[PDB]
Design a protein around this ligand. Structure first.
Ligand SMILES: [Mg+2]
Ligand SMILES: [Mg+2]
Ligand SMILES: [Mg+2]
Ligand SMILES: [Mg+2]
Ligand SMILES: [Mg+2]
Ligand SMILES: [Mg+2]
Ligand SMILES: [Mg+2]
Ligand SMILES: [Mg+2]
Ligand SMILES: [Mg+2]
Ligand SMILES: [Mg+2]
Ligand SMILES: [Mg+2]
Ligand SMILES: [Mg+2]
Ligand SMILES: [Mg+2]
Ligand SMILES: [Mg+2]
Ligand SMILES: [Mg+2]
Ligand SMILES: [Mg+2]
Ligand SMILES: [Mg+2]
Ligand SMILES: [Mg+2]
Ligand SMILES: [Mg+2]
Ligand SMILES: [Mg+2]
Ligand SMILES: [Mg+2]
Ligand SMILES: [Mg+2]
Ligand SMILES: [Mg+2]
Ligand SMILES: [Mg+2]
Ligand SMILES: [Mg+2]
Ligand SMILES: [Mg+2]
Ligand SMILES: [Mg+2]
Ligand SMILES: [Mg+2]
Ligand SMILES: [Mg+2]
Ligand SMILES: [Mg+2]
Ligand SMILES: [Mg+2]
Ligand SMILES: [Mg+2]
Ligand SMILES: [Mg+2]
Ligand SMILES: [Mg+2]
Ligand SMILES: [Mg+2]
Ligand SMILES: [Mg+2]
Ligand SMILES: [Mg+2]
Ligand SMILES: [Mg+2]
Ligand SMILES: [Mg+2]
Ligand SMILES: [Mg+2]
Ligand SMILES: [Mg+2]
Ligand SMILES: [Mg+2]
Ligand SMILES: [Mg+2]
Ligand SMILES: [Mg+2]
Ligand SMILES: [Mg+2]
Ligand SMILES: [Mg+2]
Ligand SMILES: [Mg+2]
Ligand SMILES: [Mg+2]
Ligand SMILES: [Mg+2]
Ligand SMILES: [Mg+2]
Ligand SMILES: [Mg+2]
Ligand SMILES: [Mg+2]
Ligand SMILES: [Mg+2]
Ligand SMILES: [Mg+2]
Ligand SMILES: [Mg+2]
Ligand SMILES: [Mg+2]
Ligand SMILES: [Mg+2]
Ligand SMILES: [Mg+2]
Ligand SMILES: [Mg+2]
Ligand SMILES: [Mg+2]
Ligand SMILES: [Zn+2]
Lengths: 142, 211, 38, 59, 175
RNA sequence: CUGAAAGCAUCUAAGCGGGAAACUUGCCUCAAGAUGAGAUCUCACUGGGAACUUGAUUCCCCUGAAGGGCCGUCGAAGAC
RNA sequence: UGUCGGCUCAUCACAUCCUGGGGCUGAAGCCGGUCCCAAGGGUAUGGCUGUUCGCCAUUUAAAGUGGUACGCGAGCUGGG
RNA sequence: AGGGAAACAACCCAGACCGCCAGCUAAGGUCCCAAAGUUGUGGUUAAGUGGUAAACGAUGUGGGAAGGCUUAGACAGCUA
């Protein structure tokens, strides 16, 4: 009698669609990270990808509380001396709405080959529609 | 920008004005250009036109390229180039000559510059040499220091070192058109044009304009 | 304008105002009484 | 690993892990976390019966 | 809040329309006033306009006086248009009003052309006096402040465009 | 500028503006190994059997196109 | 774990020398003084001395202050 | 040695005879990385304070004990 383990070949993956249309960035993102990892399933094992597929439709309408709309800053270094570059929440929504939700969720996942595989099941769009009507996602709240 | 012609660098010369001033001139032969494909919003996204010039043998054009040149009856030529146009209208099978340019009419010229093989730091980056006497040991044209001690402790990316003064592509902006010989297909441009004689150059209206 | 760590009224037309989280003194009589910070 | 699986299976029945252990201990049940995790995966009908016994204990 | 306890007393010729938290005033010599209210402040409708809060909050109490001021401004504007008066001092400082463009000569190397937006209209009874009429205080004041910025008053001679009801600090050269 | 809290005043608490070689574009170059590996035009290939561990399987015979390379004459291209 | 100065090559901070935007002035103008914002680009040649520094001569829009093993000898020198 | 304090001999908990895919706790903790309350009840903060620092300065905000004027008209505004 050994403990059950999930085989990467016979896992079940469903599709969900989430509306980010008045949801806090960090509290929407924790529910996404749970579904992406599979923590909501009794068959969860730490070393296989047993999560679900998540689709986010209204990416640009996510919001932050307080003065974080202006003072929240995103940094990245280009690799050349003095190459630190920055941008804030107002500018990033105008430039790339999807990069806001993708960046939040990506930091809530493990940083290893399996973590990058959990990240490939998240689709983020900015319109009211997605191109995944064939896969027939079902609405998910929060 | 947004439209232009492809030509060949024929060499530099001069012309004298009646007032007696001599103008350095680069002569550019522009064999008439043939439109190959027109790109629109519903098919490619951006708007552009595809152009061919010159002439190529029938045994050097592949079956894939021959059928592309035959959808629009154009006859194959050397190379294929594409100009990104803002708002014009072209149909596959047109002719584009030097007749979209006038005298005056600042233009930009693009070409593949002459290639220096593997240049040192003095030639490539205008470094200055160490002493040729006064005790120097086999270190006359060498670059010198490339970093600091323990802090960093690695050369920084983008350091200026030696190798390949390239045959890259460069543009020379704000060049005046002196004469437009329509019948012999010539453009006379005041100044120097990148590349050697025979190379292909692209002529487009000046982007900056103003002065 | 005079920037000090301790700003306060200098006459009887100086007014204390907090503007964008900064204490300022503005004078309707003498422009020399303008202060920032503090 | 067992705790992470009883937690996921108990919330399917409407109860957290910490509330399930309190209800099980309060009423009678002394089954291990190794067997509770196994029933969560394979015998989902028995697991529901156990959880309804823990919920009925007002805790 | 003393101001919020004072009604507006809308005059005889006016009109009101409250679409929920949306408000508008119709009047002679100008109409079409538009404003949307924060959800914490209430405007009752009767023969008289009165305002009251919804919460006991400090910010809500502050907004119950701002909206009373704003409603008062619109009622006057659609009945008596607001205006501001500008005065020009200095030799060679003259201005001519031409329809929707005001030409100013303020000692630069070229007369400046100021564009008057819709609503407000300017006319100069003299060449050293401007008048900006309008039906809303915010637009009349902003445009008057924009004209005044071209050559703000000098402290040694008062030269430059000024307000007709402005006190200007004058001093003298120590030399 | 409009404007109350605080009958006044007040650039701010709601709302609306001007504002610098700094920031983001605009100018030049590289750029889908951007493993998220994108798009467009055109071209090429239209046979049989068997063994099974019976389908993104293996083995044999026939048939190798579009095209690429080797090779040679070189080049204002180049250390190879 | 090779310690000064010179040469070649640099990189960062801002407590800004110039250029840029402003408040006050015992700011008439031309030039100034002081404080605030600003790091994009610039920022001498020689005579003396081993000199860093310094004093001189003549320029410049200005000839900034500092960290980097008081940056840099498996990059050069070797005057101290 | 083990668990915690991110990593961290000397701090906190606790002293490893061996094995177990059994249970209860210590310090420390329970949104995700990452095991366990997006638990319950009443308040405070608007500073990302929390998540560094003084003399000093300021109509930020909550609570408490008292005072001086005041329908014989108080405090701001305005007319002598
Ligand atoms: Mg060459
Ligand atoms: Mg030299
Ligand atoms: Mg020597
Ligand atoms: Mg030797
Ligand atoms: Mg030698
Ligand atoms: Mg060294
Ligand atoms: Mg390192
Ligand atoms: Mg370099
Ligand atoms: Mg100070
Ligand atoms: Mg401001
Ligand atoms: Mg007011
Ligand atoms: Mg005011
Ligand atoms: Mg505001
Ligand atoms: Mg602006
Ligand atoms: Mg410039
Ligand atoms: Mg590719
Ligand atoms: Mg491709
Ligand atoms: Mg071939
Ligand atoms: Mg072939
Ligand atoms: Mg080829
Ligand atoms: Mg060769
Ligand atoms: Mg040097
Ligand atoms: Mg450099
Ligand atoms: Mg740094
Ligand atoms: Mg500073
Ligand atoms: Mg300076
Ligand atoms: Mg300056
Ligand atoms: Mg200045
Ligand atoms: Mg000044
Ligand atoms: Mg700078
Ligand atoms: Mg700098
Ligand atoms: Mg600098
Ligand atoms: Mg710099
Ligand atoms: Mg910078
Ligand atoms: Mg710029
Ligand atoms: Mg010198
Ligand atoms: Mg010197
Ligand atoms: Mg000497
Ligand atoms: Mg240091
Ligand atoms: Mg030091
Ligand atoms: Mg140093
Ligand atoms: Mg040193
Ligand atoms: Mg140094
Ligand atoms: Mg040496
Ligand atoms: Mg040395
Ligand atoms: Mg050596
Ligand atoms: Mg070394
Ligand atoms: Mg050597
Ligand atoms: Mg010696
Ligand atoms: Mg010697
Ligand atoms: Mg330890
Ligand atoms: Mg620590
Ligand atoms: Mg540890
Ligand atoms: Mg326990
Ligand atoms: Mg405890
Ligand atoms: Mg980890
Ligand atoms: Mg957990
Ligand atoms: Mg709660
Ligand atoms: Mg913080
Ligand atoms: Mg902090
Ligand atoms: Zn004063």
């Amino acid at each position: 009698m050994k403990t059950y383990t999930a085989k990467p070949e016979t896992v079940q993956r469903d599709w969900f669609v989430v509306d980010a249309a008045g949801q806090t960035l960090g509290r929407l993102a924790t529910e996404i990270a749970r579904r992406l990892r599979g923590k909501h399933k009794p068959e969860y094992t730490p070393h296989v990808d047993t999560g679900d597929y998540i689709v986010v439709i209204n990416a640009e309408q996510v919001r932050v509380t307080g003065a974080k709309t202006t003072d929240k800053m995103y940094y990245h270094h280009s690799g050349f001396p003095g190459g630190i570059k920055s941008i804030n929440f107002e500018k990033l929504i105008a430039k790339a709405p999807e990069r806001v939700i993708e960046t939040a969720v990506k930091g809530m996942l493990p940083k290893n080959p399996l973590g990058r595989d959990m990240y490939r099941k998240l689709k983020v769009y900015k319109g009211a529609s997605h191109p995944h009507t064939a896969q027939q996602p079902q609405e998910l709240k929060i | 920008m947004t439209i232009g012609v492809v030509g060949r660098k024929c060499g530099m010369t001069r012309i004298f004005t009646e007032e007696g001033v001599s103008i350095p001139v680069t002569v550019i032969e522009v064999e008439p250009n043939r439109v190959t494909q027109f790109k629109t919003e519903e098919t490619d996204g951006y708007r552009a036109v595809q152009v061919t010039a010159g002439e190529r043998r029938a045994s050097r054009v592949t079956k894939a390229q021959a059928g592309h040149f035959a959808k629009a009856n154009v006859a194959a030529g050397r190379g294929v180039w594409e100009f990104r146009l803002g708002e014009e209208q072209y149909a596959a099978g047109d002719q584009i000559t030097v007749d979209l340019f006038q005298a005056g009419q600042m233009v930009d010229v693009t070409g593949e510059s002459k290639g220096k093989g593997f240049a040192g730091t003095i030639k490539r980056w205008n470094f200055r040499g160490q002493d040729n006497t006064h005790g120097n040991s086999v270190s006359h044209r060498v670059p010198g220091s490339i970093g600091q001690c323990q802090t960093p402790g690695r050369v920084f990316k983008g350091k200026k070192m030696s190798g390949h003064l390239g045959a890259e592509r460069v543009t020379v902006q704000s060049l005046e058109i002196v004469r437009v010989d329509a019948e012999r297909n010539l453009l006379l441009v005041k100044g120097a044009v990148p590349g050697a004689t025979g190379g292909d150059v692209i002529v487009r209206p000046a982007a900056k304009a103003r002065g | 304008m005079k920037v000090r760590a301790s700003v306060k009224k200098l006459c009887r037309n100086c007014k204390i105002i907090r503007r964008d989280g900064i204490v300022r003194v503005i004078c309707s009589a003498e422009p020399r009484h303008k202060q920032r910070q503090g | 690993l067992w705790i992470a699986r009883i937690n996921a299976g108990a919330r399917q029945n409407g109860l957290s892990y910490s509330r399930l252990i309190a209800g099980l201990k309060k009423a009678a049940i002394e089954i291990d976390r190794k067997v509770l995790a196994d029933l969560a995966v394979n015998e989902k009908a028995a697991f529901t019966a156990i959880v309804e016994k823990a919920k009925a204990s007002l805790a | 809040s003393r101001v919020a306890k004072n009604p507006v007393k809308l005059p005889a010729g006016v009109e009101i329309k409250l679409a929920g938290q949306q408000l508008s005033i119709k009047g002679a010599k100008g109409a079409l006033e538009l404003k949307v209210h924060p959800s914490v402040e209430v405007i009752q409708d009767s023969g008289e306009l009165r305002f009251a809060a919804r919460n006991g909050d400090q910010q809500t109490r502050a907004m119950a006086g701002t909206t009373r001021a704003l409603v008062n401004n619109m009622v006057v504007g659609v009945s008596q248009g607001f205006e501001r008066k500008l005065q020009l001092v200095g030799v060679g400082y003259k201005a001519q009003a031409k329809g929707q463009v005001l030409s100013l000569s303020l000692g630069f190397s070229h007369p400046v052309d100021y564009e008057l937006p819709a609503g407000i209209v300017a006319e100069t009874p003299s060449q050293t006096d401007i008048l900006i009429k309008g039906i809303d205080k915010q637009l009349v004041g902003q445009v008057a402040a924009e004209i005044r910025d071209f050559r703000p008053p000098e402290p040694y001679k008062g030269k430059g465009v000024r307000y007709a009801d402005e006190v200007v600090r004058r001093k003298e050269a120590k030399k």
